[PDB]
């Protein structure tokens, strides 16, 4: 919880995917530091090019895009 210790946890560059049935996305950098504790990560959906925003707590649990 240092704003480094948080940031060095978002795997910027990883190409993950929302579930077994979700679309793949690419992990951006920080968007906001929510007081819940976790962080809003900037994200761009790979196959549509849409940019979006995602909780890091959710992010770290999705699998790698296959």
């Amino acid at each position: 919880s240092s704003s480094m210790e948080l940031r060095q946890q978002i795997p910027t560059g990883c190409i993950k995917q929302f579930g077994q049935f979700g679309v793949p996305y690419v992990v951006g950098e920080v968007a906001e530091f929510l007081p819940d504790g976790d962080v809003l990560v900037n994200i761009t959906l790979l196959q549509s090019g849409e940019k979006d925003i995602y909780r890091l707590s959710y992010l770290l649990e999705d699998p790698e895009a296959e």
Partner: protein, 90 residues
């Protein structure tokens, strides 16, 4: 052949879905499984049954999810002919 194609808003889906966004995408496939639509692109589900009253009930089943109304970016149906796979990649 019929297709359903859709996109969720990820910020909206996480806020509104009870469980994750993972859960949203997995939920939808299961509803669309009730009416013959298999996942073929993650954002494109196909059924090969051109009955419209199937689509209709499938769409109505999808509108039953309370979070869809607040979290979908876009959702489309279309009627697909001349489905064609390419494998001249050697």
């Amino acid at each position: 052949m019929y297709a359903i194609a859709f996109d969720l808003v990820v910020k909206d889906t996480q806020d509104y879905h009870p469980k994750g966004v993972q859960e949203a995408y997995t939920d939808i496939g299961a509803v669309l499984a009730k009416f013959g639509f298999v996942r073929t692109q993650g954002s494109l589900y196909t059924n090969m049954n051109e009955d419209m009253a199937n689509l209709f009930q499938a769409m109505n089943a999808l509108k039953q999810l309370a979070w869809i109304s607040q979290s979908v970016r876009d959702i489309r149906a279309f009627r697909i002919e001349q489905w064609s796979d390419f494998t001249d990649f050697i």
